[model samples]
Target: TIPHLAIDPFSLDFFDDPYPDQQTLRDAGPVVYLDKWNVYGVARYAEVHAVLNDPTTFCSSRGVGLSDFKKEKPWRPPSLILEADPPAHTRPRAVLSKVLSPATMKTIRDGFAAAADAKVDELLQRGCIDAIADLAEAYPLSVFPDAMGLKQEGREHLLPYAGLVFNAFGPPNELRQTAIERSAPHQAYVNEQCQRPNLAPGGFGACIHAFTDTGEITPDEAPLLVRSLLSAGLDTTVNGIGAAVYCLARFPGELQRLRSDPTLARNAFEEAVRFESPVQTFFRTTTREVELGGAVIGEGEKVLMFLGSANRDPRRWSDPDLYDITRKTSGHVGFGSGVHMCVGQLVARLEGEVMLSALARKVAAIDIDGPVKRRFNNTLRGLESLPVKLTPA
Candidate 1:
């Protein structure tokens, strides 16, 4: 018999503080039947990794949410890259792969680094700041929209819309309902921004539309491809930056280590991601009957993969809970593994590396000024407010 757990993984309690429940899931068994949601869940590192890597067997084509696309109308058009599988997923993935290639990243590296330096300078002037609003939210909002060639007006809609999109992945609970109610105008703004004439020259939004000329993806498909970035791009990195600052404040020694070896900025960001996992959980449906942990999971089953839990699973890492900068985090599922792994992760890394590197160089220490509040989303994990005082080097 399958191990049965009755907890609602999407509840406010679970979203507010998930580690304890995550441990329970991991401790229960390799695969637990979540009786509350009628979904199979994998929290153990090995099983989560296996499920992510075997996308064919546990496919994303059906939907990466509780509502299978075939069974229900997707709240919005399904993401071309994220909600797709195989041959259908190929073109958009290929275009984005080239759009965010190492060479293209190199072109934007110095500019991003310079922007980070400038943002750090501004934060230092303030001395004490809410890291979430001032640094995390401000930094990405400052740079990313410009990179995507987005119009300056209505850009504030980005974060709220991202929050709504991620929340809709779970069951239509109150949180999801509220987000849907507030999301229409923001969604309309994003759609308008994805239009060709609205895009700035040389920005990624323009580049996505450029694929149409090459006969890769059609013009109709181009905006949705741009929409992919708009959906996944902003909040994930903002929360990731919040996680890094939050982690570094708690683990001053790790921050000190980063100060000494500025090169570890990238590693610090990666480690923080493994430690906090901003985008916590994503669902993948079973393509067919598959055996996991010696149990047969039937076809079309919904399996929730606890990415945050998998990142901290003791079975996978020594001293897994520690926020140490030196740990190897390459295989960590903070960014999901396999082909469906985050397409914009390179952009996130670059943003993290640049911002953290700037902070490491200028700030001698990060100290907490007040209470930290965890911002709960159905899928994303981060702080709503992180009051902190930064001492200049």
Candidate 2:
């Protein structure tokens, strides 16, 4: 029998602090019916991973949010890549996989590294800075926009556009309502920039549009694909960078560990991801009756996977709650594993790796200088103002 619980995962209170209830869900059972929303929830690593790995049973086509597209019209056109299944999902995935392939990221690595170094150099002089606004958000705002060839004037819209995309994945809550109002003009700007004319010749948007010339993806799908690229990245990486800095500040020993072995920069970023899952939770609809954790969930049931909870499941890691830069974080669902795994992950990792490496090489320590104001979102987790003073080496 499936355990039933009265949990509202989308509320502001839950987003403000999710760990306690995340643990409660795990303790309840691997799979429980969240009676408040009438959706099933899996809070453990094993089941969450199992469900993500088996996309056929738990599909994305119906929608990866509380809103089932099969029943109601999507708020916006469903993402061709994120919302499609099988044959439909295959083409766009292949095109984007090649566009964002390791080779493509490598081509942009030096640029990103230079930007990271420059940002760090400036931050050191500033001393006490809000890591979110100054470091995390600033770095990406400068680099990714250029990387995508977006115009500087409207680059400010990126965050709001991203906020709406992630927020829209949940119920039509106040967060969604607010994001909608805030994102209107920003979304319009994003849409206008995604077109071929607005993109520069050698950027990601240009590269995606270039697929049209070769007949890989049509002219019509090009702009929407660009939107997918943006939605999957940006805000997630902002939190990722913020999460790493926050982790290092909170655990000085881990920063020391990273300092000693600068190569651990990559692992440090991933470890932060596992420790503080930025993309906390999203839903998946079941395609048919399926047995999970010794219980059967009916078809068309919405299953909310607490990715943050899964990352900290005691059954998964030796010290699941600890932030160790050296810990083996393989198989963590921080990036949403399997076919639907994050397409922009390589870029996010590269951003994290470069920034962490800069910190390890130039900064002696990251001290939390003041209050940490957390940023709340229905589908993402991060700090709004992470006050910190970076000690230069």
Candidate 3:
């Protein structure tokens, strides 16, 4: 049976340290009704993973948020790919898969390592720095635009566009409203940037548009795919990089482990992603009345999967709360699992691995020098300001 719990998952206090609230959800049961939001939640590792795998039952087409699109209109256009199901979801996923190939990711990884070497060198010179503003935001904002072949001006719009998109996934709280109020100009810029004429040649955007010529993806489908790329690419990785730095700063011994092996940079990042779970939760619409974890959930029900909580369940994790770079981190739903996993998963890891390795190689210590600020979003969890003083190796 499903247990009902009165909890506000999106409250500001919950965001500050979400583990206790998440723990409450997990202890409640495999499936619990969040009375505050009138939605069902699966917080344990097993149930969340099962729900994510069965997209046919738990669909994304109705909208991946608390708001039910079948009942009301969407505030903005739905992400054709992100909010779509198969037959429609097929070609776009294929197109993105082809564009973000293993070969393409390797090229990007090499490019990232080179960029990170210089970026870290500059940060080391600064000595005292804000990891969020200087390293996390600045690094991805620089490299990713170049990869997209987007022009320099008006690039500021990307973050706001992402902020609104992620925030809109929650109930229309003040955060969502604030983002919506400031989203128009950002939306206009992003829409403009998605156009063929605006995108430069030999970039990911150009590659996506090239499929239009082969009728692999239609003319209309091309730009939205580019929009998909942008919406998925930033913020998460920015937060991910921010999370890694935060983890290392908090646990010096783990940082020492990473510094010693250097190879462990990849493991460190994976652990950090598992620990922080930048993309905290995603709402999936129940496609039909079905039994899940002994509860009969009706059709069109909005089910929120606590991926962050799922990542920490002791049933599947050891020392889930501790940031151990050496821990075995398989099957953690950080970037998600199954077909709808983050399309930018490889790229996110590439950014994190290359960047973290660069730090491990050059920096002797990462000391939290001042008050660290948290970046609050409805869906993404990460820092806003992280002050640190570096000691060079």
For candidate 3, give the lDDT. Answer: 0.90
Position 167, candidate 3: lDDT:
94
- lDDT score for residue 308 of model 2: 95
In candidate 2, position 301 carries an lDDT of 83
Which lDDT tens digits does candidate 3 get at residues 32-140?
Answer: 9987877899999999999989999999999987889999788788887789988789889999988888889876777889999899999998899999999999999
- Number of the top candidate by lDDT? 1
Candidate 3: the clashing residue pairs are none
Whole-model lDDT, candidate 2? 0.90
342 in model 1: Cα distance from truth in Å?
Answer: 1.1
* TM-score for each model: 0.98, 0.98, 0.98
Cα miss at 5, model 1 (Å)? 1.2
Off by over 4 Å in 3: none
lDDT of each candidate versus the true structure: 0.91, 0.90, 0.90
Q: Please give the clash total of every predicted structure, in order.
A: 0, 0, 0
**lDDT of candidate 3 at residue 116, scale 0 to 100:** 91
